[PDB]
Every structure is written in structure tokens, then in C-alpha cells.
Design a protein around this ligand. Sequence first.
Ligand SMILES: [Mn+2]
Ligand SMILES: [Mn+2]
Lengths: 431, 431
Amino acid sequence: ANWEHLLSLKRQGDTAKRLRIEQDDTRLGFEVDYDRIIFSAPFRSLQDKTQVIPDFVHTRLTHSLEVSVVGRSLGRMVGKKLLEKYPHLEQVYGYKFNDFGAIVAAAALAHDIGNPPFGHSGEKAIGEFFKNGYGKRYKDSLTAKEYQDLIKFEGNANGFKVLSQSKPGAQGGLRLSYATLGAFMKYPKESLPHKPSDHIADKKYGFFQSERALFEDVAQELGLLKRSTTDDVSWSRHPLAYLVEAADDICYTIIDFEDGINLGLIPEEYALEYMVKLVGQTIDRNKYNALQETSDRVSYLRALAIGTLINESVDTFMKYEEEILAGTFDQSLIDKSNYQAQITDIINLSIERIYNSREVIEKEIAGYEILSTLLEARCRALDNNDTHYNQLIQQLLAPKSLYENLIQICAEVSTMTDGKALRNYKKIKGL
Amino acid sequence: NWEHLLSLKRQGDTAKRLRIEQDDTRLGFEVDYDRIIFSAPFRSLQDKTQVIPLFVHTRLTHSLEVSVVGRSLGRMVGKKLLEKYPHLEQVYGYKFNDFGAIVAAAALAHDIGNPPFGHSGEKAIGEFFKNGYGKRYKDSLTAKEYQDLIKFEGNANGFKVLSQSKPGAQGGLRLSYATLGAFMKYPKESLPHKPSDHIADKKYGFFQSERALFEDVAQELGLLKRSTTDDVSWSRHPLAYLVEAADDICYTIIDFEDGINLGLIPEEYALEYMVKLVGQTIDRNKYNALQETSDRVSYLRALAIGTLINESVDTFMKYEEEILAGTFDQSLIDKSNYQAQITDIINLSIERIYNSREVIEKEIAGYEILSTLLEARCRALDNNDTHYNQLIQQLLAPEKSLYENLIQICAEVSTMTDGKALRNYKKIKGL
Ligand SMILES: [Mn+2]
Ligand SMILES: [Mn+2]
């Protein structure tokens, strides 16, 4: 693959090439991408959507913002080293190290934009509705891939639809640069086959059947390498996708842990115990000992640990840069960390004390009821749009092919805020 | 001199920071942005109301949008400044994105010190010390100390949040001095009160508790001294005009947009008030094809903001030497050719949003919530010996002057999210 092509500035529907050298420095396509996400309705909605815990706890927006900041740093540092390794990219094509920061920052800002409320239980609730709920009836009317899109409904694939949703007067959705869409695509495959390997890029899927033709255009423009040997399509990751993934990995590992401590779910003593190897060479022990509040000590450790992992991930990427370019790299960047034992201890403690706390379990149980009810109401009205009641349901929840209609119902349920889903649920139940 | 106005100095520095010696991947101005993003005060803006009670903009998404608009203003102005004064780049090593970085960080922080409940929030705090319980401190405070309190200023509290030292954290967030300079749109103490009608004299920008800190900042930047008595003031850092412009553009157009999507302003007013602002750049076929009100008004908003950014850049360069000399007496937007349309927009927003029952009700309740919290804190300060007042201290604040204690009480009440302020209020009243 060619970095020249991986850094495409193309937007959907373009009829002429966009030369990097001719970009206006005050309107660089990669940086416009960031601003477009910031002002978009789907991004704004993340303000009222939950990450893990339903006092201050990170929302999807604040999480996405922090990932995009760590991502910009990764892309900036890697970009400087890529331009030193491949100097024609600058001298000939005019790329600059801040271009790489901008691409990673933008894709990182949007990486969770398609996620449904109630976190991962939300996805499972939607899939179960089509696996064994009312949605079962549609199986015989859908292709294997169309149905697999529903029973394994994936927030990452919905995020791609949100970024690229064509509408009357708004073709191409947000019309992000193709390099940014490539960096966003962690799982460059369709829903079938299911886990053809245990490579991270094969663990899930990245686009619905409704968006297959769009990602084909993206993958062709970027010159991504074909990976699947069959009629099921799969491509090797855009190299910058590894940096979006590492920014995400670093943030939820360390910041969930910090939230769990500040919330009282994790005892404080674990902060120094689990992060001491991650911070040992850079911590200022006199500064730490002078800090009086728990939250300031943990935030100091978090900042040191994120700094350590950013620097290491940049070094990992450069060490394996040619394997990533050739699609032969089989792991995440963080998988190769020398602190993998510390990262695993941190994650397993977060799982035990946060994800399995009674409050998270109660929200997940409630999310199953809410989402299932909304899906059944939308689907029963789809099947019998003529009755007076189903018309009211349509007015309240949604003011094409069967598959197109079902994937749209999932996308609309998924982008409801936590509060709108509860309200619509209560009204359908009468409260 | 622009070479001193672009200082990379941080609090406590013992040696000069030359721009030419900065690591491009760790540029001081860009690090400032990251430090704000991850700070507790910035995160707290998640749960703080801007105008309408809690889609609606919070302080967080407002600050985010202002920082994006400010980054564009600074990028465009930075490019023109470097062509006007080429030695800044050729000799000193400054680049046009430095100016974008300084404005973006200062704009991101511009409302970080604001209390809950809007500008009624500040007025409720001032009223507590003017006519409420806090009036008893008047004769134990200097004129400027008391004026700090009765005209409690969110901008001055922001400067406190950004810069104030605590054990283990000297210098607060330790932002670059150029960023602190661009943050300071009122470079004066609380007295004298409005010595002129210039926008820079309308309020004040630092408490007495932070006067020595801004003296260091102003000396390092070389700000022109505007007052010679023992009442100090300086001419604004030129980039403060761009922070102010980005803020003005955002709340003017975005509050209008919010008001239409909430139903408070009939949609027909959108095209009517914004036709001049968008007419030369609007694609009518696109506009007419958009089916949803929210899509039509967000398209007009994007176009109007783009128009005002371009014009503001031109206004800045036209008056650049007067701003550098401290003789510019107006805001950039005050010079806009669209002042008629801006005024109409603001007046309708005032009538339909600011004076709506929902906002009025919320501001009236905030007065009672903040007055109650302030009184509990001051009573506990006045008599720390009683059992009740010890419980209040455990609940709300778990050796300094009277003035420093009162300013900290104000800063801490201002730090509270809307929700945490209400809960603590309810407990005090037993609800
Ligand atoms: Mn994430
Ligand atoms: Mn503002």
C-alpha cells in the first residue's frame, strides 16, 4: 500500500482529484473533518449517552473528546517519524506531520458516534430482538449477511452509517475525507464470515450491507489491500486505524480505572499499586506526596500513565510499520506493550468492580426492556402501517426495502439519547 | 511587540523558552489545549447549563464550538500576521498554527470559571455580598476586595481556575502566557468600575487574589500599561479580540438555532434574519431539498458563522496596528457590516429565549440555591465551632485571610455542577 494513496483527501461524490499541495492551509480537509463532527447532530447527542456508569462520570462525548486528544498526539508523533522515513510524502506531495494528527483526531472523535444507549448490553439487546424476539420472523426474507447485520448489530458499523448517511439535500452525510474514514474503520469487513480468525481486525465487522458499496469506494481510493480470499469482502486495516484503536485502548483502560476510584468502586490503594511500573521513571514523588486530594493524585497518575503508553505505542507502530503497511501485523499496538501485565490487572479489576457492580447490572437489565419494546413497536408498525395505533407510533418515533427499513429502525433506536429512549418507552407503556 | 506577545513562558520558569527550540510534537500552545481538556474544571462543564435548562447546548458543547471557531480565526489571522511581519517566522520560528492554538485553548477555557445558572449565577453571588448575608463583610474588606465579591465575575474566576496554586500543583494548569493573555479580555481590576465605555472596561478580569499573577503575565507579554495609578489595567493582548469574536459569533447564531429547534422561535424567522449573512454562499437547491427544520437551520448557521469568521479576520487586520497600540475601542463584531442582522437576532433571542418562562424560572430558582449554599459556607466560616457548622463543612468543604476564604467559597460554589448544587441545597433544606 502507498502512503500517498492512504492519505486521500477525497470526499463522497468528488469528480476531480484533491491534491494535498493545493489545499488551503486554513481549510485543510482533514481538519475540516474534525469541525464537521463537532457541530453535527449525532456528535452533540453523545452529551446525553452513557459510556459505562449511568456526580461526574465520563459521558460518551467526554470520552470521545479525550480519545481524540490522545489520538492527535499519536498521529502527530507518528507523522513526524513517517515524514522522516518517507520524505517524498512532504517534499513531493506536501503532507505535513499535523495532517496525521488531524486524521487520527477526527476518526477518534467519531469512533463511538454510532453506539446505542446502555453500552454493550444495548448492542446485545438489539441483536437478541432479531435472533429470538419479534425480529425472528424476518430471517426468511433476508440474506445471510442482511440478517447477520441485525443479530450481531454492531455500533462501529452504525457509526459508519451515521458518518456517511445520504439524505435529500445531504448526500454523503458529513462527507469526511476518505483517509479519515479509513482511519475510523477498525474492522474492514462485512458481517459474514463471523470471526474468520482471532486477529482483532476480524473480531467484529465494520459496515452494514447497506454501506458496503460506500466502503468499497473508500477502500479502492485508499488502496487498501484485499484480505478475504472468498466472495465475502475483507481488507487489511488502514495503518492509521491502529492509532485510533490505541488511543481508545489507552483511554478506557486508564480513565475507567480513574473513574472507578473517584466513584468509590475501586479502593484508592490500587492506583499506585497497578500503575507504579507505568509511571515510575517519570513521576515526581515530591509533587505526588504534596497532592492532598485523592482525585488530584489519581489524575496525576493517569496523565503520567497515558504519556508512557502514548510514547510506547508510537515506538511500537514504527517498529512494525512495514508489517502494518503489508497487512501482516496480527495484533493491536497495545497487545505488544511491555506493560501488558499491568494493563490486564487494571482491566480485570475494572471488570470486577465497575462493569459487574449492581448499578451497571441494573441499567443493563433496564436497557434490554427499553430497547426491545421500542424495536417491537417500530416493527409491528412497519408490518401493519395502516392501523390508527401504528400511525401514532410512527408519528412519535419516526416522523424502501424491508432490509433498508429494518437497518434504519436499528439506526434510529441506536441514536436516541438515554433519556429519549426512556421517555418513548414510558409513553408506549403509558406513564 | 509580537515577539513578546507570543510568549511560551509558564509560571515559575527560571529560563527563557525560545519558539525556535520547541519540539513540534509538544508545542507549548498545543499542550495548553490538552491540559484544559483533561482538567476537572473543564469536565465539570458537562453538567452546567448555558442558557436553557438541560438537545440543548451545555457550557461544554458551547465551549467546544467556540474553541473550533477560535482556532479558525487564529489560523487565518496567524497566516496574515506572518506575511505582514515575516521576521516572526524567518527569525523567531513562529508558524500560523501557533496563533490558532493560542486562540483555541483560550476560547476552550473562556467560560471555565462560570457559576451554574448562567449570568444570573454571577449576579446571585454578587447579590449575596451586596444585600444578602455577605454584606456584613464590607467593613472588613478593601474597596476592591468587596467589589470583587459584589460584582463577582465569571471571567475573573476563570483566571483563578486556570492559574491558582495548591500543594503539589503550583501554577494551576500552567498554561503558556500567550494563552493567558488571549484569555484576558478585561485586563483590569474590579475598580474603578467602568472607567470608560470601551468593551475592555465593561467588567474586570482578575480578582485581587490573582493581581500579582497577572502582573507577571502582563510584564512578560509586554502589554501596554493603560492606567498609571495604584489602579492597574493594560491594553488587551491582540489575540483576546479573536477569542471574543469567536464567542460572540457562536452564542449569537447558535442560541438562535437552539431557540428554533426548541419551538421558542418560529422557523420562518431563520431565513428572514439570516438571508444577508448567507446569501452569497448558500446553495438554494441544497436548502430547498432539506426536509427537516433542524437540517435547514444548521445549514444556515454553518453559512452565517463562515461569513462572520471571514469578516472578523478582515476587521482584525484592518485595525491590527491600532490593536497593537491599544487605541482600538470596540469589539471586532461591533464593526460588522451585518450589525443590523446581528442585533435583530439578539433581540429576538432575548425576547423568545432569555425571557421565556422556563429560563426566568430557572434563574429565579438558582438565586435561591446559590444564596443558600453561600450562606451555609459563610456561617460555617464565621462559627466553625458548632456541631451543625462542622457537619456543613464535612458536607461542602472536606489558614488564610478573610478575603481569601470568601473568594475560595465563591470559587467552590461556582465549581459545582447544576445537579450537585441542587442536591447539596436540598440536603441543607432537608428535602
Ligand atoms: Mn471508545
Ligand atoms: Mn461563552
